[PDB]
Amino acid sequence: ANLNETGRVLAVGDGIARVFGLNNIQAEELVEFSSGVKGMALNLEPGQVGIVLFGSDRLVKEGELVKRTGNIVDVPVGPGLLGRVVDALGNPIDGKGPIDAAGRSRAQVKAPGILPRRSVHEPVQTGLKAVDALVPIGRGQRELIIGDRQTGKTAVALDTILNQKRWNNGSDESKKLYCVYVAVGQKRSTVAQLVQTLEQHDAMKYSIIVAATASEAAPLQYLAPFTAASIGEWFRDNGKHALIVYDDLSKQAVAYRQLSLLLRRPPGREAYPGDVFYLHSRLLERAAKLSEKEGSGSLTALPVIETQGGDVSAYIPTNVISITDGQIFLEAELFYKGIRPAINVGLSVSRVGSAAQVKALKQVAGSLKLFLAQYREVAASAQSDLDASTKQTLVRGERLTQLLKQNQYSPLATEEQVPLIYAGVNGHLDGIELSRIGEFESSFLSYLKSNHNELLTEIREKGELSKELLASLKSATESFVAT
Amino acid sequence: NLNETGRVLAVGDGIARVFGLNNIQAEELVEFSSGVKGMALNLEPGQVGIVLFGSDRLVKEGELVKRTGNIVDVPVGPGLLGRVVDALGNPIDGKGPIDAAGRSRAQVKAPGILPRRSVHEPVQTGLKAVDALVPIGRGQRELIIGDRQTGKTAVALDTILNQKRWNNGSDESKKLYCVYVAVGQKRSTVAQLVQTLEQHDAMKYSIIVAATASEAAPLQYLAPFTAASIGEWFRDNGKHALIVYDDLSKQAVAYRQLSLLLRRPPGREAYPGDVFYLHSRLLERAAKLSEKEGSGSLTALPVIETQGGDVSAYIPTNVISITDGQIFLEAELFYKGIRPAINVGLSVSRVGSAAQVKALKQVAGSLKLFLAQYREVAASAQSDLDASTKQTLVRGERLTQLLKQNQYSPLATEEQVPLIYAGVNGHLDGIELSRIGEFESSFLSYLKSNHNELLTEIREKGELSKELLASLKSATESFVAT
Amino acid sequence: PITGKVTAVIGAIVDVHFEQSELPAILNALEIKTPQGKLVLEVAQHLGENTVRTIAMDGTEGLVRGEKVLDTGGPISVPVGRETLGRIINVIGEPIDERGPIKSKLRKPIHADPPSFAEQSTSAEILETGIKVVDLLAPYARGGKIGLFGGAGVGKTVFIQELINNIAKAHGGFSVFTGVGERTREGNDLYREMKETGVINLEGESKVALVFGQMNEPPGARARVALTGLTIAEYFRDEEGQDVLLFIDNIFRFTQAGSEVSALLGRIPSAVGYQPTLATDMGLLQERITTTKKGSVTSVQAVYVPADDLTDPAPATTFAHLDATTVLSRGISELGIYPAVDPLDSKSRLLDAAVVGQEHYDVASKVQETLQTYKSLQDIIAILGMDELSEQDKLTVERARKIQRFLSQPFAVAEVFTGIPGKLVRLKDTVASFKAVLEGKYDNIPEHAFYMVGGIEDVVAKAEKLAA
Ligand SMILES: Nc1ncnc2c1ncn2[C@@H]1O[C@H](COP(=O)(O)OP(=O)(O)NP(=O)(O)O)[C@@H](O)[C@H]1O
Ligand SMILES: Nc1ncnc2c1ncn2[C@@H]1O[C@H](COP(=O)(O)OP(=O)(O)NP(=O)(O)O)[C@@H](O)[C@H]1O
Ligand SMILES: [Mg+2]
Ligand SMILES: [Mg+2]
């Protein structure tokens, strides 16, 4: 037995195997145990190596042989993973056979530096009225989806993926956006069901699923987002665009905490290791928009965080907020009232997306940012005087609040969006009741499609509002409202 | 030798680390040169970790240690009644040797699922509030819980006192033998307790098992299990023992000392991962045995002291969830003169009615209710309120007052029900609040001279017929008018 | 026959030494023969030097270093099959009902992998329960997990039993009840009550298997029992193809046990003192309760909330896996409403157009809407008298009171305690029945016609008998 290429197990417990030999091993090299279970050389010491396991401890005994692999932790990458569901190490879990890899990338890849980047200016269209109008996301950005349990976090990301069906059926490769969805810590059934939804809406052919679910070993959960970013990165490095959802990072952090405490690293705040920030920061730095010279690709990140009791000041929330380029905060209070998406506009922001917004939306979003989240000034005070001036903003406010509502699985085209907002901002809804704003919107879009389709087409094709189209839009709006 | 003996490697803090003793049992008892005893809690490859029963000034490195071959046991039997013993069952009261029926181990399998029967026979505490609102049944584990100095021992103690009513009889099935465990208390406090029982002639049916504040941690740790086995002789032989563990807070402290000094891993509040197991192991031993198995019972009143009323603390949590309910005491109430200071709305007995004399259940039905509705409208007790609320307030004040009781004065059931009845039904409404006490006293004596028949029926039948109720109604108004 | 020797006994932790690579796999059940009977240990770690560390499933007092220890060659195994129904079984698969050996022919390990991603049913779907409140307003997910809330005195045990019964008759699926840290007194109650109710039938055929891990057992035992109970439940799914109920009372006591085992194993505690493996420990149990292509194990888990703090890491981790809650309230009980389910409190992920259809959803959302203003209107009706109500308000409130009572239902199991005949209303009826009432097609019926009746036809039948 070569002790250079090979090892003998000294001990195993707490997700670590202590191994003797493997003298030629590299730090962070993947290893193989007798049972076929894999590991990662984490700490090389005089006279032994400490290996973190990617499975149950049952699958490793004392005295067993361990084989070197040659390879730092890596994964298959390339357009051949499209339509596929894999585990954190890249192994298919969808019943469909060997993955078709263009090649292999490490799990841990260094972020694009200061030079190879350019500011985001290309829209990521979500098809969500509230997000596209008020927290516009640009290709290369990082935008946190954050909020309590059961507040629509996943819905927001999933509508975004379903929405890409719009361009991923065209030919123009630059407008396309491939999707990597990472499930970390979720239930197997949630993810199975999610994939079936994707299949049913025909979204699956442009998306990749990477799953490390609830009963799997902490390191597989720790690892999944990293192997998913290299999968995402392939598109970035080859002049194409990929969206990556990390659902969710809260659970990644928890798994990382499990590993650190069993590794006997000192518990800090909320028991997380000191490096739990570096955990996320290195991951998320890999999202970017690249320069002309680097082929202009982009990886856009939508990490998901789960607050407890709505507290965005906890350690992990604030860590991620101090990394991403903004947050979409979802309030449980709005969610229970029926306001869904429950986007708390006061607390939501996109730091770089404004540039990348579609002009049409930008133009009918005049101050909507300021006004709405400020109607919130009056609204909170309202329930001391039956005022004159501030009775108007209470009626407009209430309207735009309904306009922003949106059914699930129903992402809407920009040119379907801008009229609804124009019709809100200019007060053509002021007279219509609350209970009918829902029906108004479906009936109004029908009207526009059948009768004023020339104009929608112009919004879609130029993305701007010429004074003439602006005036023509005023025309068609007034007509419908009157009846 | 080495199979039967050992050398002291190191000693300190009541831990003796010992070489050899290769054939010793876990939890087995050892003897040292100097004569100090201990038990072997840690069996390890190199050594054995022994916790000491006495000062470790008596142990040295190199010293010889022998096996005794025994796990901790304790004498048990009726011959312990009236006696005061340490945790190993040695007499400490200067009354001579203790005659033992035989010997039981400290640690005994609690009765299984099958050899039991639902709790039904009452443990009559004699305390109006308890017997009416938080009834306890033979076999039940009911927790007496609260901050310091709130009357916890008193609840246990008036209960033990109240058992004179049957413990002077001849019907062994009705008698309730009493075991009191003093864990961590001061000796003069145990002395004064004993004297109290002696004065009320309750020592004759009680056994005091004492592991006081200056005694080595193992003995405080052991005392409860040891007392438990003493209790179990009664249960296993067709009788009924009550065990009070005063208190389990202090026992958990003792076990934590041992574990920290044996270097077992610490957890929340520095407790070992098996401190829940300690108490559940201990408390599941209280049980109501099946007819096949003799119908014996052991009923436990564990005590827990909270700090600032924080029942989410590690040890109260453990014990609240192990047991069948809480009698919750409170300084606030106490200072207001409500004594016992039982917080009705926080006290419960999951067993409930199944363990209450039917008569008391009949009159108390609504007591549960009015008082519930009282503490809901309380903040109103400070002018303009409709005749509905004025009434609710009038009633509750008086029912609260009726639940006050002096110490050392437990009431018979037949004394309790007419008092509760008068209140529950509005016979006290017209009586100024300061006079409810003297009312109780006078009313009882009046029933005793004029209506001994009603009292005898209540006691002898346990239920109230419509004839009894009607009789009670008349005799009450009769007195209230007078 | 692979043998070892005890080398250490520290409380419920026992170390055993073996011969070269003759070492038991982590999670193997080991056995020592004691004069009590036999002591099972479960291998926890390979410490090195042919020594493994184990957790005791029973007491270790009396053990001696050097004592023989036998390897079973696998994890704790439990009997599976119909010969477990009506029996009481401990964590190690032994009968504890003094009724003799479980004459089951097969045995399975308690530790096992979850259904593969590919094995996973791909569409969420309702498990119809025969109970109005639940089916209509907070339906159970097939192969889902449900949080059962509210402690005691709210008819939990009757509610659980009705479920065992409704599922067996409506879907021919059996039940397994797992008392995780069960109080011996209460287990003994439950057993006697199950016989009285019929769901256990010692002389006939039983619908439920009882597995108890009592409070007086070492954490090791309390942590594993859930998996014991679950293995039995999996056999009914994987081999008999049934839709199976698994009860876990109480899920928090599973967590605390693992918290305690983790502490005895030397592991540094995480936030709030829970085990660093809190979430995976939870996942290793939950992910096994799901729908395969063969059937489903669906689980009703009783959930304790420490300090009533819902952000506490134990509920927080649990909630992640819950598809619905059934909230039992004394406040519903003290208005004489049985089962004491709270219609506003109890919530389901599946009350959803896509899962239950547009009918079902619309009916339930209105009921919900109705009951909601009636709740806020309890405030003004208590002060202003009744008469001070507006046109649509004074009607819906007369019709809410009517809905609120129609949510009652007689339980076939309660029958023996009540004498009232029991009703298993099909979801089909439940939907229409409530849609009709909402439309005003029964306003001219006095409220009492709505109390303790099954489907609409009994509101019809009842009101005609009140007439004379
Ligand atoms: N825009 C929407 N309109 C109406 N209903 C919605 C919308 N978005 C989500 N829902 C529903 O609300 C529930 C919560 O949404 P989901 O996207 O699962 O949020 P989440 O924050 O990821 N919850 P979880 O991850 O399970 O804690 C789901 O049942 C959705 O079906
Ligand atoms: N019903 C009562 N009426 C009046 N005084 C009482 C009553 N019960 C107890 N006391 C007194 O109140 C004090 C506290 O009672 P005690 O039974 O010592 O409570 P405790 O909770 O055990 N306190 P400690 O053990 O010292 O923390 C004692 O001085 C009692 O004599
Ligand atoms: Mg989600
Ligand atoms: Mg005291």
Side-chain angles (χ1 to χ4, degrees), chain C residues 153-204 206-362:
Chain C
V154 270
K156 223 162 94 179
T157 63
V158 159
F159 185 91
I160 282 151
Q161 287 179 323
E162 183 68 340
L163 283 171
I164 304 174
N165 175 77
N166 285 19
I167 300 317
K169 304 300 227 291
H171 312 300
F174 297 125
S175 297
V176 174
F177 178 96
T178 304
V180 169
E182 179 85 14
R183 284 183 217 72
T184 310
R185 188 193 57 93
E186 283 191 12
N188 180 271
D189 275 340
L190 188 65
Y191 184 55
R192 174 194 40 77
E193 191 164 334
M194 276 180 175
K195 288 186 270 189
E196 277 167 352
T197 200
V199 311
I200 291 174
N201 194 348
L202 289 209
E203 326 84 62
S206 301
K207 291 189 230 309
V208 66
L210 303 189
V211 178
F212 284 145
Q214 295 146 29
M215 261 178 201
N216 62 323
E217 296 184 64
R222 273 143 37 225
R224 303 311 190 216
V225 251
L227 312 174
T228 297
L230 166 72
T231 297
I232 292 177
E234 293 174 327
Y235 181 83
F236 293 127
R237 188 193 58 215
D238 299 327
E239 228 77 29
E240 293 210 37
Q242 305 170 10
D243 285 329
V244 183
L245 287 188
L246 168 76
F247 298 85
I248 293 160
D249 189 336
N250 177 310
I251 193 60
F252 169 84
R253 287 199 303 254
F254 164 85
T255 297
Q256 280 302 327
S259 191
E260 300 160 41
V261 148
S262 189
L264 296 167
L265 288 178
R267 309 175 174 188
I268 275 63
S270 183
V272 209
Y274 293 91
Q275 59 270 38
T277 48
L278 168 63
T280 35
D281 287 359
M282 180 60 75
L284 282 166
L285 161 69
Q286 300 293 21
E287 291 270 85
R288 275 163 84 170
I289 299 153
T290 181
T291 313
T292 71
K293 304 159 170 197
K294 240 315 190 163
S296 63
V297 175
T298 307
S299 186
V300 173
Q301 315 191 338
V303 189
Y304 178 81
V305 181
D308 295 319
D309 176 22
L310 282 161
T311 63
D312 176 285
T317 309
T318 312
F319 255 94
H321 291 269
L322 293 188
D323 295 284
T325 69
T326 299
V327 167
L328 291 170
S329 159
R330 16 280 121 165
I332 310 282
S333 192
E334 279 160 29
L335 295 166
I337 305 270
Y338 272 117
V341 181
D342 194 327
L344 292 187
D345 276 69
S346 289
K347 275 166 181 167
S348 175
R349 263 159 26 62
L350 305 215
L351 202 81
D352 192 299
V355 182
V356 296
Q358 199 58 53
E359 268 259 67
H360 196 319
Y361 178 87
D362 289 7

Side-chain angles (χ1 to χ4, degrees), chain A residues 153-155 181 186 190 247-248:
Chain A
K153 297 187 299 295
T154 292
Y181 177 85
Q186 298 169 44
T190 303
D247 219 337
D248 56 63

Side-chain angles (χ1 to χ4, degrees), chain B residues 27-239:
Chain B
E27 294 181 54
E28 180 181 322
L29 224 50
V30 309
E31 130 155 319
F32 288 90
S33 290
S34 55
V36 83
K37 291 196 177 100
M39 74 176 313
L41 296 178
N42 272 25
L43 311 184
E44 294 166 90
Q47 32 175 35
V48 160
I50 291 151
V51 300
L52 304 160
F53 286 177
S55 180
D56 59 49
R57 169 182 176 79
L58 299 156
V59 177
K60 280 163 144 204
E61 178 196 309
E63 186 133 321
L64 187 66
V65 202
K66 314 172 160 159
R67 286 183 68 205
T68 61
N70 312 303
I71 323 288
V72 188
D73 67 0
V74 66
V76 303
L80 279 157
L81 297 166
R83 304 309 299 262
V84 185
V85 294
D86 69 8
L88 296 178
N90 305 297
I92 65 168
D93 57 9
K95 288 165 142 201
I98 322 255
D99 285 345
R103 302 181 59 88
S104 301
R105 291 191 175 178
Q107 310 284 343
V108 179
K109 292 268 146 51
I113 276 298
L114 203 87
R116 290 167 180 254
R117 189 253 189 74
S118 279
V119 167
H120 65 285
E121 312 153 302
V123 171
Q124 269 150 113
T125 59
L127 291 165
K128 293 173 282 197
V130 177
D131 295 338
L133 304 175
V134 209
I136 303 171
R138 316 210 147 177
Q140 179 172 352
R141 289 78 39 81
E142 183 93 351
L143 177 66
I144 303 183
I145 185 170
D147 286 351
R148 56 164 222 270
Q149 286 146 357
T150 54
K152 308 185 300 294
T153 297
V155 168
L157 187 62
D158 286 337
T159 294
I160 299 194
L161 283 188
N162 198 46
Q163 307 312 314
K164 281 199 261 173
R165 310 192 188 271
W166 312 271
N167 299 346
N168 291 315
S170 274
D171 173 352
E172 290 289 322
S173 76
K174 292 193 185 165
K175 290 164 160 219
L176 188 47
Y177 296 83
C178 288
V179 176
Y180 178 88
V181 196
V183 182
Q185 299 174 25
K186 72 177 193 218
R187 278 175 171 152
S188 60
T189 287
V190 188
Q192 171 60 60
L193 180 107
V194 163
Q195 179 161 115
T196 297
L197 296 171
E198 291 184 333
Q199 285 166 1
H200 288 70
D201 183 52
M203 267 305 264
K204 59 171 171 186
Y205 56 69
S206 306
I207 292 155
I208 313 296
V209 171
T212 59
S214 96
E215 302 211 65
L219 302 161
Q220 305 189 43
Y221 147 74
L222 283 162
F225 301 96
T226 255
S229 302
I230 293 171
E232 276 161 0
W233 178 91
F234 298 92
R235 186 196 74 183
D236 298 2
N237 289 283
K239 332 210 168 196

